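Action item from last week, closing it out:
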Amino acid sequence: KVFGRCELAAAMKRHGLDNYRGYSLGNWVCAAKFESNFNTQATNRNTDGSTDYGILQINSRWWCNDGRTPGSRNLCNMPCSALLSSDITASVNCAKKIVSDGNGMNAWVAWRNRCKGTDVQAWIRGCRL
């Protein structure tokens, strides 16, 4: 499912992401935008053999099990296919664990390179929240 900007914002808010660990909602919407383009079904394989899954492009080496990443840690205790659902509950629950891991949102390369330090508020502008 390809979410609309305001639709995603509202579902993320409902799920407790606005200001989670100090990150305003605009940050999370911006990250989803550049990581997956708001598409829950997005996947991309990496050179190390791991693969990123879903709306927030969560990596298989550490967070989920896809049964094809030797040495995966599966820290979110779930198969990576779960992160591709139209229901973002799993993705949000896992992202909460990732963002709390010590390096914050820098865990997401697109956030760090395209969202960090920008007016992230523009991402939720015009939405009924």
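Closing note: The domain at 1-129 is CATH 1.10.530.10 (Lysozyme).
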